[PDB]
Amino acid sequence: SGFKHVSHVGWDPQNGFDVNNLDPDLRSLFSRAGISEAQLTDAETSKLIYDFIEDQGGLEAVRQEMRRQGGSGGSQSSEGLVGALMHVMQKRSRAIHSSDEGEDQAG
């Protein structure tokens, strides 16, 4: 009782997620959720993101469910876990993968 469970993701905390070597199953999820590689490579967003894969049953559950979520209802896999992750992404409060070229909130 009270045992910990580690998900075999193998993501980097400094570099972020290996979007360059991510699986078409899990990588597709982030895309469906409107998550750009910039967020997958961000140490901050990377942490909250991969953590979601743990709630979905781990990396194995993602690729696994992605296959199971491609038959029931419609046919396209996305209407489900993608909805949850979409919320997790909102856990940043103001995380926007944008570039400040000359903006200023204060005026």
Is the domain spanning 1-107 CATH 3.90.810.10? The answer is yes
Indicate the DSSP class of residue 12.
B
- Measured over the CA atoms of residue 58, residue 59, residue 60 and residue 62, the dihedral's sign is positive
Q: How was this structure determined?
A: NMR
Domain coordinates in residue numbering, the chain: 1-107
Secondary structure (DSSP) of 32-87? HTT--HHHHS-HHHHHHHHHHHHHTTHHHHHHHHHHHTTTSSSS-TTTTHHHHHHH
- Rounded to whole angstroms, the Cα distance separating 20 from 27 reads 10
